[PDB]
Amino acid sequence: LLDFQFDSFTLHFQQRLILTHSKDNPCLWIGSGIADIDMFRGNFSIKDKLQEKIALTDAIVSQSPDGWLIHFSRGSDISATLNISADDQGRLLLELQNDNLNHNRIWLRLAAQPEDHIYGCGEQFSYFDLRGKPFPLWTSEQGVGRNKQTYVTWQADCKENAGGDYYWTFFPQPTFVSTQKYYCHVDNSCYMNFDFSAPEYHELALWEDKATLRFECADTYISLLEKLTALLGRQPELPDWIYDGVTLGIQGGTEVCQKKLDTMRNAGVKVNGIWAQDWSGIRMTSFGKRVMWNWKWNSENYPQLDSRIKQWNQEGVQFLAYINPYVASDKDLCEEAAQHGYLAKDASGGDYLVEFGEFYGGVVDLTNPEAYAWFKEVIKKNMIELGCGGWMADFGEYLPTDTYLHNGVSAEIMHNAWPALWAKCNYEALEETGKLGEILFFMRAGSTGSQKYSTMMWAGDQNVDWSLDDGLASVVPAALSLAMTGHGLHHSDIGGYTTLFEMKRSKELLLRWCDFSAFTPMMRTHEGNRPGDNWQFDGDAETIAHFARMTTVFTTLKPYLKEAVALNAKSGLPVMRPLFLHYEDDAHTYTLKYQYLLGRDILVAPVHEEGRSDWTLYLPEDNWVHAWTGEAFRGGEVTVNAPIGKPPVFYRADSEWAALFASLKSI
Ligand SMILES: [Ca+2]
Ligand SMILES: [Ca+2]
Ligand SMILES: [Cl-]
């Protein structure tokens, strides 16, 4: 189980070499720094002012009750302790504590092999295999473009550092899987940087004076994910109605929603819902219309919505809304918050207001237990009691680092923990009203614990483009990285979101994205931030009939998806899966980024480029049947015709669901 051999030492854990240390090749450095943060409205620029970094070359080992205690030191005056133990469940527990609080930097090297791959670290959009690169772990806006060599990224960076880079995300997490078949989970929420660049070791940098790391091994990845999710959390089963069609993203009030619902339904589209983020009203800005950030039904913008929700529910249509953890400073909720001390504060003791351009929002202080209770009641009374079937629970990634919080923990530490705290507020609202498995909320931000508390992740803001780092393609590493970090329910905005700098959503992008989303567990559209510039679900008859066809595809898969979702809830086996979960012996499957398995038996490789008439993907060794033609294929690279509406989807001839899958092509 734990094999500690000892000047120099080695620690093996179920035969994986975890730590090696000598005077000449230490495993531990400590020191100190000052965080140098430029927030840029959530587009954080975060770097160190490094003061010291000192190698703790000397170690003295004692036997401990639980396991081992290593005293690391350098000279007479600098030291740290590392306790090594099994935890309650047999996980390897490493507990590091620096000599004093002033040494707020740790660098720890974990032994590795040059061939190892590494997956996880939350939701990663440019890399799935993380080997070869470093990953700062700091929740932020995800970036527009995300690649310093693309034009959109350069444009966004000219304005508020908004372009981002390959590691930017709203759901980074200090949790990874190695192909030595273990996971490592770090309890801290400070800034960290996980460096997977060096062939012989991983280096984990923490901006704290202490660290706690836990490891478990397993015989298979599937077992590993079961263990990881026993640690972090498992999601609920989705409500049954999620499988019944597309949720239409509509703004502009009750009657606009009505007309669009009818147009789609009368053309044969399977529609399970309407998601109207302007349920709370419309705020005019110099850049067009924004949602009004006060979380109560606005009967001026949505007349008769209370009775309309009932009528829609009678016809099999749920109503979904929107909430975030800020409150518009000129409206009711924020005044109430200001009166009861429910807002975060600034250094001078005033209520902290964040600028979102011309308008401001108070930051709800979720570490204040009365503010938390209060905001949960807002959810219960203003959304659940109104009859909402779900909502977007947006933001979480932008707790400013110069807030002062009720629990007295530094915002430098609370910033990364904010998303799962927000998620818990939502989850408890449902738990307390008996609505788990009936109401569905979806989030973009996350952190450790979102695995229990977020009932569905969405991929946040993609560009309305075909880029690798911020377009349709980027959703696939996002799903797969999350899957390997223990969250197995994931979807994206059908057609993407970010409509800036002359990017506008084509019909072709919308239809290709619809083809992708019909092979995921949830179908939901978005108008984008500039709705008039984008092609929408009702743009013409061909678009509408396309939605009719692919929503019929999606609804036909219902029982298969429902089985997959039940496995996710039961054992953390995610719905969209890396191919190596089922083809472990196939070396090629470890480096794939842009294809996945939907449950066990369907392989999907979404077309993510403009102007394609065919598509090339990889099949591992199995008996595959192309969904649309019934052509049989074996293992290897394959190129197939891929017109819109016939995405590159294959299923296993031997699946017990083969008769359901054979029926797809005659829809
Ligand atoms: Ca983006
Ligand atoms: Ca009116
Ligand atoms: Cl790929």
Side-chain angles (χ1 to χ4, degrees):
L1 211 91
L2 277 114
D3 168 24
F4 190 86
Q5 300 176 297
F6 42 127
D7 191 40
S8 95
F9 73 79
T10 60
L11 168 68
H12 285 80
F13 168 57
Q14 319 214 321
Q15 279 125 92
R16 283 67 164 187
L17 178 60
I18 297 303
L19 306 172
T20 57
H21 174 85
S22 63
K23 252 223 195 238
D24 311 277
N25 283 317
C27 74
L28 175 70
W29 295 246
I30 70 169
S32 67
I34 300 154
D36 182 4
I37 296 171
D38 295 304
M39 299 197 287
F40 290 115
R41 320 179 76 197
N43 298 295
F44 285 89
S45 167
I46 173 155
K47 67 149 63 60
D48 209 356
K49 310 179 85 78
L50 183 61
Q51 293 168 160
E52 290 188 288
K53 175 184 202 202
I54 305 157
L56 307 187
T57 55
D58 306 340
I60 299 172
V61 183
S62 49
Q63 275 296 335
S64 175
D66 297 48
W68 289 269
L69 177 64
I70 311 184
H71 295 266
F72 289 95
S73 71
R74 183 68 175 274
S76 67
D77 54 347
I78 311 148
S79 62
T81 56
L82 172 66
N83 226 93
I84 301 177
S85 81
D87 84 351
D88 310 288
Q89 290 76 45
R91 308 200 186 78
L92 174 65
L93 179 62
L94 305 187
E95 289 164 299
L96 232 170
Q97 177 61 71
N98 287 353
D99 51 0
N100 64 75
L101 279 185
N102 296 305
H103 282 139
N104 69 343
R105 300 283 175 273
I106 289 155
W107 301 253
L108 174 74
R109 309 183 169 179
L110 308 180
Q113 304 159 334
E115 62 268 22
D116 297 338
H117 309 276
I118 293 293
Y119 305 97
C121 288
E123 189 177 14
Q124 295 296 334
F125 288 89
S126 297
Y127 289 102
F128 174 39
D129 182 9
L130 307 181
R131 205 82 191 279
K133 297 287 257 190
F135 296 82
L137 299 173
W138 181 262
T139 192
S140 76
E141 303 312 310
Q142 190 247 14
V144 170
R146 306 179 71 267
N147 183 321
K148 300 314 195 187
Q149 305 205 116
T150 69
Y151 180 54
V152 165
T153 311
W154 172 80
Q155 296 179 282
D157 272 349
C158 290
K159 185 190 82 150
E160 298 261 39
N161 197 44
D165 210 344
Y166 68 83
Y167 61 87
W168 283 33
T169 175
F170 31 59
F171 192 169
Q173 192 171 303
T175 303
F176 68 89
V177 169
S178 168
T179 56
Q180 296 198 36
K181 287 183 180 182
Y182 67 83
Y183 70 71
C184 171
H185 176 64
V186 177
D187 284 347
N188 301 54
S189 68
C190 59
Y191 179 88
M192 290 183 253
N193 186 326
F194 281 20
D195 181 5
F196 300 114
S197 290
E200 303 292 339
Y201 58 87
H202 306 321
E203 183 167 82
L204 312 187
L206 301 88
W207 290 14
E208 210 161 346
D209 66 294
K210 72 200 226 298
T212 298
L213 307 85
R214 279 163 225 284
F215 306 69
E216 273 185 279
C217 301
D219 286 342
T220 62
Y221 297 105
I222 286 170
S223 180
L224 192 67
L225 295 181
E226 182 178 19
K227 287 172 186 195
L228 179 64
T229 59
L231 178 58
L232 307 172
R234 293 181 187 131
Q235 294 96 65
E237 293 181 352
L238 297 175
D240 197 62
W241 58 263
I242 297 288
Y243 309 107
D244 296 339
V246 62
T247 293
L248 299 167
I250 308 168
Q251 299 178 101
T254 309
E255 284 300 294
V256 169
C257 288
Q258 196 56 61
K259 280 202 84 275
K260 291 184 191 294
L261 171 66
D262 288 326
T263 295
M264 295 305 274
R265 271 190 319 198
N266 298 344
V269 184
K270 309 307 195 280
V271 181
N272 74 343
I274 295 176
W275 168 54
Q277 64 173 357
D278 65 334
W279 76 296
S280 68
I282 297 172
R283 174 104 68 181
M284 213 63 206
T285 68
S286 52
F287 328 99
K289 306 201 301 290
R290 236 68 282 160
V291 173
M292 174 75 63
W293 293 8
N294 195 71
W295 322 121
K296 189 155 43 228
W297 161 40
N298 185 314
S299 61
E300 301 294 353
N301 200 42
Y302 277 80
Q304 311 189 270
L305 175 65
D306 51 356
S307 58
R308 200 55 65 82
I309 290 170
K310 299 286 172 268
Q311 173 182 321
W312 287 334
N313 290 353
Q314 280 159 28
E315 301 170 348
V317 179
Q318 290 290 324
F319 182 73
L320 295 83
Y322 175 104
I323 186 164
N324 77 40
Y326 308 102
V327 282
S329 64
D330 63 336
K331 299 281 171 189
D332 284 351
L333 298 178
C334 192
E335 181 191 347
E336 179 170 37
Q339 290 167 21
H340 293 71
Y342 292 165
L343 302 177
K345 279 127 167 30
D346 70 11
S348 63
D351 286 338
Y352 199 114
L353 306 181
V354 177
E355 278 171 324
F356 299 100
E358 32 271 275
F359 301 90
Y360 308 84
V363 179
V364 175
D365 183 358
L366 299 176
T367 74
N368 178 340
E370 295 161 46
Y372 180 96
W374 167 72
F375 210 53
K376 173 151 52 64
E377 294 299 315
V378 168
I379 293 161
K380 286 155 58 174
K381 156 116 298 309
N382 294 358
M383 317 181 69
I384 295 171
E385 284 178 22
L386 178 68
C388 293
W391 46 90
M392 175 180 281
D394 198 10
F395 283 96
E397 79 288 348
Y398 187 33
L399 179 74
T401 35
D402 62 355
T403 51
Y404 291 81
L405 300 156
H406 190 269
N407 69 357
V409 181
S410 175
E412 295 178 16
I413 301 293
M414 289 311 302
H415 172 77
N416 278 346
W418 215 250
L421 193 47
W422 172 222
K424 191 181 202 216
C425 187
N426 287 272
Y427 177 86
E428 287 180 336
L430 279 52
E431 198 184 16
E432 294 171 7
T433 48
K435 295 296 182 151
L436 289 172
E438 283 163 54
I439 289 171
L440 186 81
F441 64 91
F442 51 100
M443 302 192 72
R444 64 182 164 100
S447 62
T448 300
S450 289
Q451 294 77 13
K452 182 168 171 28
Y453 296 126
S454 177
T455 44
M456 169 68 74
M457 308 304 306
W458 114 94
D461 54 292
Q462 279 74 62
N463 289 350
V464 294
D465 77 15
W466 305 91
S467 59
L468 289 181
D469 298 285
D470 212 4
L472 190 163
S474 75
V475 179
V476 189
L480 295 178
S481 59
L482 279 174
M484 295 307 287
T485 312
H487 200 302
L489 306 173
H490 194 255
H491 75 289
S492 62
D493 297 312
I494 293 168
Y497 172 79
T498 304
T499 312
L500 293 176
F501 309 120
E502 306 318 311
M503 288 182 306
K504 303 181 161 36
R505 192 194 291 134
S506 68
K507 181 168 160 182
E508 184 192 351
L509 184 62
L510 187 64
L511 302 196
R512 282 293 197 196
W513 215 302
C514 188
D515 284 359
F516 169 31
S517 296
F519 294 90
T520 70
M522 179 170 168
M523 294 192 73
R524 178 188 54 76
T525 79
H526 206 309
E527 298 183 343
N529 58 297
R530 290 179 190 165
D533 288 350
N534 287 334
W535 196 269
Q536 308 297 348
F537 62 70
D538 58 350
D540 70 9
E542 181 184 3
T543 304
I544 291 162
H546 187 77
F547 277 80
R549 170 195 174 71
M550 308 313 291
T551 61
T552 301
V553 170
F554 170 77
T555 56
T556 301
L557 300 174
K558 172 172 190 183
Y560 175 71
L561 294 177
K562 180 161 189 85
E563 173 187 84
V565 166
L567 291 159
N568 189 66
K570 182 189 161 74
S571 68
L573 181 55
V575 182
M576 294 163 67
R577 302 176 193 178
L579 268 64
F580 61 73
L581 295 193
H582 298 299
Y583 300 87
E584 283 195 6
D585 56 338
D586 185 331
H588 193 56
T589 64
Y590 292 88
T591 59
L592 297 173
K593 303 171 68 160
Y594 302 118
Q595 59 174 87
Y596 62 101
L597 297 168
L598 186 65
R600 181 64 189 91
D601 291 336
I602 295 174
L603 181 151
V604 186
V607 173
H608 63 67
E609 292 168 9
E610 203 181 344
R612 296 299 300 251
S613 73
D614 61 6
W615 194 248
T616 297
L617 58 131
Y618 180 74
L619 299 176
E621 199 57 77
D622 216 321
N623 288 313
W624 290 106
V625 184
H626 182 248
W628 313 110
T629 63
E631 183 164 358
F633 287 102
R634 303 176 295 280
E637 208 71 19
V638 66
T639 298
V640 291
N641 281 346
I644 286 157
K646 296 179 185 192
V649 172
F650 304 75
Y651 70 85
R652 288 183 60 246
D654 300 321
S655 174
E656 70 275 24
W657 296 101
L660 184 63
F661 305 147
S663 84
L664 294 178
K665 86 174 68 54
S666 52
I667 270 156

